[PDB]
Amino acid sequence: TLTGGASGNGTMTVPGDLSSAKFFVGEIYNMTYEFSTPYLKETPPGGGLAV
Amino acid sequence: TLTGGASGNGTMTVPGDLSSAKFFVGEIYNMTYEFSTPYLKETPPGGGLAV
């Protein structure tokens, strides 16, 4: 429930008895890493790198 | 014996007769060195090292 607890605080319901357990609470956020086009690089005659 | 000698000093009993020998006395301490994971390294095209 978004709100409705004491002083307007949010409420949550979970199975089991957690009246004496130790736990965190919070949201979840995603991570994303997109690789680039794989190529080849070799040294040109003038020096440096070319693709 | 942890204590009980003269002036509360510790005592130690060893076999043999050591009334005229020359000897040290003290504790012992250990030495530990743990190697890492062995790997291979080569030179990448851009210079430097990689594993």
Of A18, A42, A5, the C-alpha closest to B44 is A42
Chain A nearest-CA distance from B42, in A, is 16
Residue A43 to residue B46, Cβ atoms within 8 A: no
The residues, any chain, with a CB within 8 Å of residue B3's CB and separated by 6 or more, are B9, B10
Q: How many cross-chain Cβ pairs, A to B, lie less than 8 Å apart? A: 6
Q: Count Cβ atoms below 10 Å from residue A45 Cβ, excluding itself.
A: 6
Which residues does chain B have within 8 Å of residue A41's beta carbon, measured at their own beta carbons?
45-46
Q: How was this structure determined?
A: cryo-EM
Chain B nearest-CA distance from A32, in A, is 25
**Cβ contact A43:B46 at 8 Å:** no
